Amino acid sequence: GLECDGKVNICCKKQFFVSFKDIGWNDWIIAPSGYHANYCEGECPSHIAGTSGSSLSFHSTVINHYRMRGHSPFANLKSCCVPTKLRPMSMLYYDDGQNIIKKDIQNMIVEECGCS
Amino acid sequence: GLECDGKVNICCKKQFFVSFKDIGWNDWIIAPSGYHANYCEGECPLSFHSTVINHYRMRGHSPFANLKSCCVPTKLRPMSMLYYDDGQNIIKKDIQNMIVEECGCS
Numbered sequence: 001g002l003e004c005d006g007k008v009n010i011c012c013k014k015q016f017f018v019s020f021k022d023i024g025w026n027d028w029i030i031a032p033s034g035y036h037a038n039y040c041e042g043e044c045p046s047h048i049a050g051t052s053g054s055s056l057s058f059h060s061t062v063i064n065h066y067r068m069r070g071h072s073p074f075a076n077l078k079s080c081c082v083p084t085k086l087r088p089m090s091m092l093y094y095d096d097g098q099n100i101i102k103k104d105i106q107n108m109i110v111e112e113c114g115c116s
Numbered sequence: 117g118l119e120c121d122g123k124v125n126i127c128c129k130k131q132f133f134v135s136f137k138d139i140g141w142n143d144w145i146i147a148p149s150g151y152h153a154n155y156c157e158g159e160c161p162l163s164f165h166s167t168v169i170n171h172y173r174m175r176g177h178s179p180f181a182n183l184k185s186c187c188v189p190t191k192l193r194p195m196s197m198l199y200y201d202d203g204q205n206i207i208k209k210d211i212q213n214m215i216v217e218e219c220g221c222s
Contacts (some may be wrong), residue, residue: 011120016179023171037165040222041183057213059192062134062153064172066204073132077157080186082222086165107190116156 001053001084001112004042011042011081013113030092030100041115044079052084052114077116084114117190117218120157127158127187129219146198147208156219160185166222191218 004012019034020026026033049067051059066074089108095101120128136142137151142149166185173180195214199208 018168023168023175039166039169039179039183057192058211059153059189059213062139063155065139067164074155077155080184080188080222082186083165084190086163105164107165110165116186 001114005040008072009043009044011040011044011113011115013110014041028094032092033088035089035108037108038110039080040083040110042081042113044081044115046079047113048115049079050115053114066102079115081113083112085110085112088112117162117220118158125159127156127160127219127221130155130157131215144200146200148195148197151195152215154216156187156199156216158187158188158219159220160187162220163190166220185221187219188222189218191216192218193217 002010002012003009004014016039017034017036018037020029023032045104046067050056050064056064063074086107087109088104088106089103090102091108092102094099118124118126118128120130130153131152133150134153136145137149169180169183170185173183173185176198192213193215194210194212196208196212198206198208
């Protein structure tokens, strides 16, 4: 998908460093103490609705069939710039009942952004 | 996720069945005849990433203070399909991102 840069005004990926100390979770997360999570931001005009950069899923093609024609169900749903692919991350943390756990947590890192 | 039931207002999955005959795609899609594609709908006042940006947003901190949270698919599933190629060749393929399985807020 698109990464943000000078003069890009549409849905794109930007960096975002999460520090667990900041949001107070360093009390139960041992490692990593912070990480690059990233996020998505930007406009989703109608000519990119439902896309993820250079690709259009089959589901989105079905939806855009109805949007293109103004068919009510989908004519009214607005397009949002959101992650369309995330990736897991290994973490070490205290769990309620288990104490110290090491485990891959899913949907930690935004990999690709797109318009809903 | 939740499934819409006409009473709940927060982000839920709506069932939606698509017939390829109705929308005029049955000239190149051989099977199945249609399927439940479903979609996402409802208010966003569950993934770890969304949770994390939730915290920051709540701290009235510029990055996410003004980023709208939207109801969107959080899981999609593939389907098997049979369709004609550009060569008018029948292909059996597992198409990905065909069915919305789960909805959640960004």
